[PDB]
């Protein structure tokens, strides 16, 4: 009953999604409502690190994503696409040990989950571009 990476990451995404409608609340507190007995010690630890990392680097993350947007602005994207991009960019830059392909493929899955095939393709395009110019060298192999 190990908690899979996909579920741990989805909890992070759910906290980001919910915060869009609860902007006066701390993203960390929102994550704590989502995390419960169904998540193991490692998944809780990981989700908390992700949420704190995204909160601590939000400006830099948003600014970086925006360098790849033109027709759409980060604020005009849906709550799903904006937060999938934030989550994936954080993971790409800061979670060493996760292959670029895993971050991108899983992020596309979340975008398709709550969006459409077109959402997935859109996300895929932006992330491929961010990864090819910003993936840390530890992920080259």
From Swiss-Prot:
GO MF terms, alphabetically ordered: RNA binding
Biological-process GO terms, alphabetical: DNA-templated transcription termination; transcription antitermination
GO cellular component labels: cytosol
InterPro entries with a match to the protein in the record: NusB-like_sf, NusB_fam, NusB_RsmB_TIM44
Keyword annotations: RNA-binding, Transcription, Transcription antitermination, Transcription regulation
Subunit structure comment from the entry: Monomer or homodimer; in equilibrium, with a preference for the monomer. Dimerization may be employed to package NusB in an inactive form until recruitment into antitermination complexes.
PANTHER family: ANTITERMINATION NUSB DOMAIN-CONTAINING PROTEIN, N UTILIZATION SUBSTANCE PROTEIN B-RELATED
Described purpose of this protein according to its UniProt entry: Involved in transcription antitermination. Required for transcription of ribosomal RNA (rRNA) genes. Binds specifically to the boxA antiterminator sequence of the ribosomal RNA (rrn) operons.
Family membership noted in the UniProt record: Belongs to the NusB family.
Name listed for the protein in its UniProt record: Transcription antitermination protein NusB
């Amino acid at each position: 009953m190990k908690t899979p990476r996909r579920r741990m990451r989805l909890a992070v995404f759910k906290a980001l999604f919910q915060h869009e409608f609860r902007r006066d609340e701390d993203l960390e507190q929102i994550l704590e409502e989502i995390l419960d007995e169904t998540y193991d010690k490692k998944a809780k630890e990981d989700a908390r690190r992700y949420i704190r990392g995204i909160k601590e680097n939000l400006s830099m993350i948003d600014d970086l994503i925006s360098r790849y947007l033109e027709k759409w602005s980060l604020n005009r994207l849906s709550v799903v696409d904006r937060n999938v991009l934030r989550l994936a960019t954080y993971e790409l830059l800061f979670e060493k040990d996760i292959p670029i392909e895993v971050t991108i493929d899983e992020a596309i899955e979340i975008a398709k989950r709550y969006g459409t095939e077109n959402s997935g393709k859109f996300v895929n395009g932006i992330l491929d571009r961010i990864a090819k110019e910003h993936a840390p060298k530890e992920k080259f192999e």
